[PDB]
PDB file of C-alpha atoms in Angstrom:
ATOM      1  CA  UNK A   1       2.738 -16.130 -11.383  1.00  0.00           C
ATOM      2  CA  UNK A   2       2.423 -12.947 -13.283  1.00  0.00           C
ATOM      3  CA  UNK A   3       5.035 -10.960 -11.250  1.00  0.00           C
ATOM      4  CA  UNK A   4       2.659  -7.949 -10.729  1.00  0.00           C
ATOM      5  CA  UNK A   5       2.705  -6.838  -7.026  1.00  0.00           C
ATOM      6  CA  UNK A   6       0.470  -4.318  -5.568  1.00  0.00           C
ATOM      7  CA  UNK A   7       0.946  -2.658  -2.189  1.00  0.00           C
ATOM      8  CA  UNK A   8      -1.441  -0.156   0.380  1.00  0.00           C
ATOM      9  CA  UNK A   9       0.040   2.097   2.387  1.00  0.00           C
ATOM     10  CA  UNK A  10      -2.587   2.358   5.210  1.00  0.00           C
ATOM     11  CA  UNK A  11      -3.843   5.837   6.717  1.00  0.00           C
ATOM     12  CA  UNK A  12      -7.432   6.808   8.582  1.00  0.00           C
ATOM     13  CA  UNK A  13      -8.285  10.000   5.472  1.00  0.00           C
ATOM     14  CA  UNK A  14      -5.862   8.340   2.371  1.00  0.00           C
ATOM     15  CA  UNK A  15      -4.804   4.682   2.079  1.00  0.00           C
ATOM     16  CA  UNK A  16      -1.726   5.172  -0.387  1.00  0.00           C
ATOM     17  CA  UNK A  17      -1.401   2.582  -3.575  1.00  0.00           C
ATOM     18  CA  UNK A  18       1.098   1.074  -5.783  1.00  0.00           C
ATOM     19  CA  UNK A  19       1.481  -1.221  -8.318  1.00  0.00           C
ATOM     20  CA  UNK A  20       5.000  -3.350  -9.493  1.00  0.00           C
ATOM     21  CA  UNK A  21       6.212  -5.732 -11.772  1.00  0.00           C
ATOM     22  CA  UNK A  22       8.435  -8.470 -10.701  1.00  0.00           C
ATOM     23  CA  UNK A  23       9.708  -8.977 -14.638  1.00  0.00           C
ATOM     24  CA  UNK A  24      10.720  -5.590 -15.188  1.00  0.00           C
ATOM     25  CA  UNK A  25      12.031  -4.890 -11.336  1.00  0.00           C
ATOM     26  CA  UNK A  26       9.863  -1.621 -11.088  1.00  0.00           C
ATOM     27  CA  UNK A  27       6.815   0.049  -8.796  1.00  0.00           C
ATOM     28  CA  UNK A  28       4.814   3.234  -9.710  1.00  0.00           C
ATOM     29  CA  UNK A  29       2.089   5.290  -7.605  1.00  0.00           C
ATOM     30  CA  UNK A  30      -1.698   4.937  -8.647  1.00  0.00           C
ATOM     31  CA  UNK A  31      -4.280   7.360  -6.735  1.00  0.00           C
ATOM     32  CA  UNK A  32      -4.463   7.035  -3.086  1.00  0.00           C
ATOM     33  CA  UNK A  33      -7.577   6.048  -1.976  1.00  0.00           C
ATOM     34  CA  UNK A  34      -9.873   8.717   0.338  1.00  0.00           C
ATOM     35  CA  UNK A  35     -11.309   6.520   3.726  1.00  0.00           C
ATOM     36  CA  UNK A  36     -13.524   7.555   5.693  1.00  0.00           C
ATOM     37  CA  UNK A  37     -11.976   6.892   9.237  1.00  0.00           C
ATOM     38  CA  UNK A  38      -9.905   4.094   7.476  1.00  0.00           C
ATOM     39  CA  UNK A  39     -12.571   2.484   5.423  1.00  0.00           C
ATOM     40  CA  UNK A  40     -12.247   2.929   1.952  1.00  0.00           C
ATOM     41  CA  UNK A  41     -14.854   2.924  -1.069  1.00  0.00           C
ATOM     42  CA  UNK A  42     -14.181  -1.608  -0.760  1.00  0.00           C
ATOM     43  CA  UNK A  43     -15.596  -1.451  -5.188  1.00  0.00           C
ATOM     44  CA  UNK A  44     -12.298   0.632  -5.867  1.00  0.00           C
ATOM     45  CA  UNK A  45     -10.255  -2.157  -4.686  1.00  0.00           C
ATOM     46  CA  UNK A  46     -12.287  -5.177  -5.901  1.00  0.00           C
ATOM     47  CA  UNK A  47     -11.449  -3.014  -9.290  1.00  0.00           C
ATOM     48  CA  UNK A  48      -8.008  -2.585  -8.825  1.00  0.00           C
ATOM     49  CA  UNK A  49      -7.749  -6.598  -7.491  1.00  0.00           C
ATOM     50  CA  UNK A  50      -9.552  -7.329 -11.113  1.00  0.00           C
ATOM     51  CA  UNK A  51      -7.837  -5.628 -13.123  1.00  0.00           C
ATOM     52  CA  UNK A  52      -4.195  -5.942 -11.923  1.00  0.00           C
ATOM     53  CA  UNK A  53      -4.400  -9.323 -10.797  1.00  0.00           C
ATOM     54  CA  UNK A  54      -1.631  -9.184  -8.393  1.00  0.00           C
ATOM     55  CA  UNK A  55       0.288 -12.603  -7.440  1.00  0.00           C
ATOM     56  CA  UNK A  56       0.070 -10.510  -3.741  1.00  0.00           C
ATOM     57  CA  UNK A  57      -1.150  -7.887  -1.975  1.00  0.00           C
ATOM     58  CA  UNK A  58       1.578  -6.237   0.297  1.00  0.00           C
ATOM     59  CA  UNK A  59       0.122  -3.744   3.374  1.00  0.00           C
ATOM     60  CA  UNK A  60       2.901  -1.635   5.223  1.00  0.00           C
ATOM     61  CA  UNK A  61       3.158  -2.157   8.936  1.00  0.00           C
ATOM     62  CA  UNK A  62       3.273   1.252  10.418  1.00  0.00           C
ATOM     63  CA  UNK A  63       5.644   1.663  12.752  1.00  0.00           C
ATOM     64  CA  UNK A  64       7.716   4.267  15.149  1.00  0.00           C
ATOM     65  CA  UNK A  65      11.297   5.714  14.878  1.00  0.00           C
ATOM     66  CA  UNK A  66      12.220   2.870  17.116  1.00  0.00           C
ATOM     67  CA  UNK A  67      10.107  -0.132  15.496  1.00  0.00           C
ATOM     68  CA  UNK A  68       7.602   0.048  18.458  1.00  0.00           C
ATOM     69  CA  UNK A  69       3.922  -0.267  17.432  1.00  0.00           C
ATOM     70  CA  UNK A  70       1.598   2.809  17.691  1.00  0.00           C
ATOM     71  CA  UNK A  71      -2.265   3.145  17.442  1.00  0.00           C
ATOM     72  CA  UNK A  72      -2.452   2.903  13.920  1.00  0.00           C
ATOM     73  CA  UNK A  73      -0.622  -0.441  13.479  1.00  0.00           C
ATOM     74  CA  UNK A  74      -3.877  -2.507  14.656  1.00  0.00           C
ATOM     75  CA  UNK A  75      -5.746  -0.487  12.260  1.00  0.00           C
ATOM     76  CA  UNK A  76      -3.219  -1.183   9.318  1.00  0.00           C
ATOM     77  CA  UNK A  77      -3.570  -4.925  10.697  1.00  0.00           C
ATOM     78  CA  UNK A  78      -7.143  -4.837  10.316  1.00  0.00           C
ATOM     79  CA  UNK A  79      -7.253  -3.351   6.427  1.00  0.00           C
ATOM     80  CA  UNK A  80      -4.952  -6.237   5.788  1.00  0.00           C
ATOM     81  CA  UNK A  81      -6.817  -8.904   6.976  1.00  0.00           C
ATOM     82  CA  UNK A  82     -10.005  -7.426   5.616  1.00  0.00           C
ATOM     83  CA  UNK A  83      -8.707  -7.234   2.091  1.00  0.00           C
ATOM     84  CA  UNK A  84      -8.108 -10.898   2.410  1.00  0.00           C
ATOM     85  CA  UNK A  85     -11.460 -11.377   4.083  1.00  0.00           C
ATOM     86  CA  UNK A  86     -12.851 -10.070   0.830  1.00  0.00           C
ATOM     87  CA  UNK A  87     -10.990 -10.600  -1.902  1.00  0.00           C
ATOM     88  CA  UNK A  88      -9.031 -14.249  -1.018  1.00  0.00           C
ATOM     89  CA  UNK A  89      -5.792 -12.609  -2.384  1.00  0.00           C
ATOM     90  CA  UNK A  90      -2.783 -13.367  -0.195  1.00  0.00           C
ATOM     91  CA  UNK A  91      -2.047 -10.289   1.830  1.00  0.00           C
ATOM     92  CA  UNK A  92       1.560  -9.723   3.576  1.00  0.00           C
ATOM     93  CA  UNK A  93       2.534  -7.098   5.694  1.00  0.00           C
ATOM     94  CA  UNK A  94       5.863  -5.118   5.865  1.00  0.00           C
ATOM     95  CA  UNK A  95       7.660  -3.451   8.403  1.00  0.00           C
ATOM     96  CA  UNK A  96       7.186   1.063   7.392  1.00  0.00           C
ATOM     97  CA  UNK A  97       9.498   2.835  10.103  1.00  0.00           C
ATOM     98  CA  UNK A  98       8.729   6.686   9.874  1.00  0.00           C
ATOM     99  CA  UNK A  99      12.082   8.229   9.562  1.00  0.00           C
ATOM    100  CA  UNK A 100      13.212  11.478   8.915  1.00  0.00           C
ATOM    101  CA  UNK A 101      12.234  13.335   5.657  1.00  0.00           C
ATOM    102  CA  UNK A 102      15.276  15.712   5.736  1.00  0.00           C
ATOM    103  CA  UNK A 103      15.439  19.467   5.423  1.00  0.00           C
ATOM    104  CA  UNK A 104      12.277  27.232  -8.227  1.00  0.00           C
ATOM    105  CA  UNK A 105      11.611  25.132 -11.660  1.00  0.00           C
ATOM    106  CA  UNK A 106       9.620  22.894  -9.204  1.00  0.00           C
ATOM    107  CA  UNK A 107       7.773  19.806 -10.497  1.00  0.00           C
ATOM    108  CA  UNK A 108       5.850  17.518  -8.658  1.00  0.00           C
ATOM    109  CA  UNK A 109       3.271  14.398  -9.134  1.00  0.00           C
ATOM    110  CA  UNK A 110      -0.404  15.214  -9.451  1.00  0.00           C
ATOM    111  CA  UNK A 111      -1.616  15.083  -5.524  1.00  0.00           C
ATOM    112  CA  UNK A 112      -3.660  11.994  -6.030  1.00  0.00           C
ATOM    113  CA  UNK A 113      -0.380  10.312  -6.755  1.00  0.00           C
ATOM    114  CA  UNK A 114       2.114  11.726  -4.502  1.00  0.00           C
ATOM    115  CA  UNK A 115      -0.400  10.971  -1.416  1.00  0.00           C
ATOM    116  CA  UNK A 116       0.503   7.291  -2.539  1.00  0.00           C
ATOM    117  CA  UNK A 117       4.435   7.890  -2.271  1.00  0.00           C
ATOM    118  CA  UNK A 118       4.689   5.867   0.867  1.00  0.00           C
ATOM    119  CA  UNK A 119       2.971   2.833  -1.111  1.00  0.00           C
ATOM    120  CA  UNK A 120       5.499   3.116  -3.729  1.00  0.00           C
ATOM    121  CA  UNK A 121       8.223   2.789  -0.915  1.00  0.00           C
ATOM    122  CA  UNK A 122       6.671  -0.010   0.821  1.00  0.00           C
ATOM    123  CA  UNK A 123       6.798  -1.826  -2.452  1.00  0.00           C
ATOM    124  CA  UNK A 124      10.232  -0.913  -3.612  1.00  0.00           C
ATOM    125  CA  UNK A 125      11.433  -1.821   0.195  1.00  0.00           C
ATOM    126  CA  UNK A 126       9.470  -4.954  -0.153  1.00  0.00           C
ATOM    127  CA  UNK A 127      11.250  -6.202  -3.634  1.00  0.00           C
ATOM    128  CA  UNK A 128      14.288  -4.948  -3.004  1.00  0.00           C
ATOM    129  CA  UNK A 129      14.349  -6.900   0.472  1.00  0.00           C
ATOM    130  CA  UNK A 130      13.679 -10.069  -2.269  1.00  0.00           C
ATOM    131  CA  UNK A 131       9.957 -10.727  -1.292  1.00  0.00           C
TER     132      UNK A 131
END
């Protein structure tokens, strides 16, 4: 086991991505990915899969406020599964409440990373919850 993690943050125009390391205790944004009604480019992941060599793929389940599911929570389901369909890496899924976001020398990711944020917080949820 290498210790290097990667997580999707699943969405139907952006599927958000991350990468951490187990050894060092730390996650960091890549580029989201653009789908086209939640299908992405599949040769940008089999790239990222290749390269990183994750011990596991982690996919946020989207859910409400309240932890009830909502429409896009079968959809997330069905990224999962077909990242495991074609890649054979183990794929786990972890609860993503929404939640409140709450209420001048400004600095701020490039966009391409920042559309992954929510990737990066599935991750960090994910190892700090000691997955």
């Amino acid at each position: 086991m290498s210790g290097t993690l990667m997580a999707f943050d699943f969405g139907t125009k952006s599927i958000g991505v991350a990468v951490g390391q187990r050894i060092t205790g730390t996650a960091r944004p890549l580029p989201a990915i653009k789908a086209q009604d939640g299908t992405p480019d599949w040769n940008i992941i089999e790239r990222l899969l290749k390269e990183w060599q994750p011990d596991e793929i982690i996919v946020g389940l989207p859910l409400n406020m309240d932890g009830t599911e909502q429409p896009l929570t079968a959809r997330a389901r069905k990224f999962a599964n077909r990242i495991h369909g074609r890649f054979g890496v183990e794929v786990k899924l972890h609860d993503e409440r929404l939640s409140t976001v709450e209420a001048g020398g400004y600095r701020a990711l490039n966009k391409g990373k920042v559309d992954s944020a929510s990737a990066v917080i599935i991750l960090e949820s994910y190892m700090e919850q000691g997955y």
